[PDB]
Amino acid sequence: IERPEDFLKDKENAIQWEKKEAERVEKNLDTLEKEALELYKKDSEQISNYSQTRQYFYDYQIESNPREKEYKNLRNAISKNKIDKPINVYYFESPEKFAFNKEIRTENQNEISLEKFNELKETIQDKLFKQDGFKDVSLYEPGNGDEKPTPLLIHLKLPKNTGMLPYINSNDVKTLIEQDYSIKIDKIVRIVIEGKQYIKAEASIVNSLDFKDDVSKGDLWGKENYSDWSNKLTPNELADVNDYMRGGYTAINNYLISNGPLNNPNPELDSKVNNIENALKLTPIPSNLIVYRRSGPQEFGLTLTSPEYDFNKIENIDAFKEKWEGKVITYPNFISTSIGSVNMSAFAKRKIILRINIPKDSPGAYLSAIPGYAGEYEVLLNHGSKFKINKVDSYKDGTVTKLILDATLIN
Ligand SMILES: NC(=O)C1=CN([C@@H]2O[C@H](COP(=O)(O)OP(=O)(O)OC[C@H]3O[C@@H](n4cnc5c(N)ncnc54)[C@H](OP(=O)(O)O)[C@@H]3O)[C@@H](O)[C@H]2O)C=CC1
Known part of the structure; x- marks a missing residue:
C-alpha cells in the first residue's frame, strides 16, 4: 500500500498520489462516463442538486428526466473505483446542513465565542444526519491558499469499499464521491487557519439500507x-x-x-x-x-x-x-x-x-x-x-x- 489512511496536513504528497490515481482511474471509464464527468466540471451545481432530490418524483418523471441519464453515468463512474482501504476526507459545510440555522461567526470576526461553540455542539451533538448526492472533497486538510467557504470543516472517514472518483479538473486535482449514508459528528474542535478560527468536526458514517x-x-x-x-x-x-x-x-x-x-x-x-x-x-x-x-x-x-x-x-x-x-x-x-x-x-x-x-x-x-x-x-x-x-x-x-x-x- 503506497498510501496512508489520512494524508493529514501533507498537501504535497496527497496531490502527488491523487494526480497519479486520477490517471489510473480514467482508464476504467467509458465514453458515456467521461461525458458525464465533463458535464459535472461544467456545472456542478445543477447535477449535485438533482442528485439530492431525484428519487422523490413519480417513477416515470425520474425515468424521463433529461438529467437522469447524466446522474446514472456519473454514479457508475464513481462506483467503478472502490477503494481497497479506508481513507479520510475533508470538506467545508454550511452549519444549516446540521440544523444550526444561525451563523457560527462572520468573515469579519476571526474568533468564535464559546457561546456559539457550545450551542453548535449541543445542536449537532448526538444526531444522525442523512447525506445524499454528489460532493467534492479534499484528501488533505485545507491550509493556506485553499478555499475556505464556511467556518465549519468536516473530517470524514470513508470505509474500505467506498466509491471514489479522483480526477483532474483544469490544472488541479479534485475528488468526487456520492453520499449515500448518514453522518454522525463524534467531536468538534476549534482550529486556526490563516489567523482565523474554524470548527473542525470529526464525523463517522452509519450505513443504512x-x-x-x-x-x-x-x-x-x-x-x-x-x-x-x-x-x-x-x-x-x-x-x-x-x-x-x-x-x-x-x-x-x-x-x-x-x-x-x-x-x-x-x-x-x-x-x-x-x-x-x-x-x-x-x-x-x-x-x-x-x-x-x-x-x-x-x-x-x-x-x-x-x-x-x-x-x-x-x-x-x-x-x-x-x-x-x-x-x-x-x-x-x-x-x-x-x-x-x-x-x-x-x-x-x-x-x-x-x-x-x-x-x-x-x-x-x-x-x-x-x-x-x-x-x-x-x-x-x-x-x-x-x-x-x-x-x-x-x-x-x-x-x-x-x-x-x-x-x-x-x-
Ligand atoms: N402514507 C404513506 O406514505 C403510505 C400509505 N400506504 C397505504 O395507503 C393507504 C392509506 O394511506 P394514508 O391515507 O396515508 O394512511 P393513514 O391511514 O395513515 O392516514 C389516514 C388519515 O388520518 C390522518 N392521520 C394518520 N396518522 C395520524 C396522526 N398520528 N395524527 C393525526 N392524524 C393522523 C391523516 O390526516 P391528513 O390527511 O388529514 O392530514 C390521514 O389522511 C393504506 O392502505 C396504507 O397502508 C402504504 C405505504 C405508505
Whole structure:
C-alpha cells in the first residue's frame, strides 16, 4: 500500500498520489462516463442538486428526466473505483446542513465565542444526519491558499469499499464521491487557519439500507426476509393482521388516536392491537433501513386550508422548522411506511415527507410480502412509535414546495 489512511496536513504528497490515481482511474471509464464527468466540471451545481432530490418524483418523471441519464453515468463512474482501504476526507459545510440555522461567526470576526461553540455542539451533538448526492472533497486538510467557504470543516472517514472518483479538473486535482449514508459528528474542535478560527468536526458514517426509488430491489429484500413471517404467527395473530389490512385499520387506528384504550376501552380492539404488536416483534427489522411516509397536514397539526401549510412562502418554512426541527413526534396509531421514496397518486397533494431511519432490530414487518398486497411496498411500524426530527429540508415538486423530514426512530 503506497498510501496512508489520512494524508493529514501533507498537501504535497496527497496531490502527488491523487494526480497519479486520477490517471489510473480514467482508464476504467467509458465514453458515456467521461461525458458525464465533463458535464459535472461544467456545472456542478445543477447535477449535485438533482442528485439530492431525484428519487422523490413519480417513477416515470425520474425515468424521463433529461438529467437522469447524466446522474446514472456519473454514479457508475464513481462506483467503478472502490477503494481497497479506508481513507479520510475533508470538506467545508454550511452549519444549516446540521440544523444550526444561525451563523457560527462572520468573515469579519476571526474568533468564535464559546457561546456559539457550545450551542453548535449541543445542536449537532448526538444526531444522525442523512447525506445524499454528489460532493467534492479534499484528501488533505485545507491550509493556506485553499478555499475556505464556511467556518465549519468536516473530517470524514470513508470505509474500505467506498466509491471514489479522483480526477483532474483544469490544472488541479479534485475528488468526487456520492453520499449515500448518514453522518454522525463524534467531536468538534476549534482550529486556526490563516489567523482565523474554524470548527473542525470529526464525523463517522452509519450505513443504512435505503432503496430510494428502486422499489423492485426493496421488494426483493422484503420478500426474502418476510416471506415466511406469516408462518411464524399464531392463527389468531394472522387473523388480526389480515383483518387490519382488509379494512380493520380504520377502526383500530381511530381507536388508538382518540386514545380509546384509556377514554373508552374496547376489549375486542385491545386484543387486536396486542396481537398485531406481537406480530411485529417476531421478525424484527434485520438491519438499519430507511423508510418513507407521505404525511397529511393533520399529522403535524395543520389543515389543507391553514396558511402555514403553504411552504412556497419561506416564513411558513421557518415557522414549521421552529415548531418541529429537533423535536420528537409520537404516533399513537400503527404507522405504515414505504421502502420506496417515489411519489404516488393519492399522495400527490401531500407536502410532507417523513424519511425515517429505523435501527436494526426494531419492531416491524414488510406486510407487502403477503400475496395480494403487491404495489404498496409497505413496512408497518408499531403503534406508539417515537420519531426524532433531526433536520428539515425542502424542494420543489412542480410549483409546490414540499418538506423532507430527516427523522430517526427512537425506542
Ligand atoms: N402514507 C404513506 O406514505 C403510505 C400509505 N400506504 C397505504 O395507503 C393507504 C392509506 O394511506 P394514508 O391515507 O396515508 O394512511 P393513514 O391511514 O395513515 O392516514 C389516514 C388519515 O388520518 C390522518 N392521520 C394518520 N396518522 C395520524 C396522526 N398520528 N395524527 C393525526 N392524524 C393522523 C391523516 O390526516 P391528513 O390527511 O388529514 O392530514 C390521514 O389522511 C393504506 O392502505 C396504507 O397502508 C402504504 C405505504 C405508505
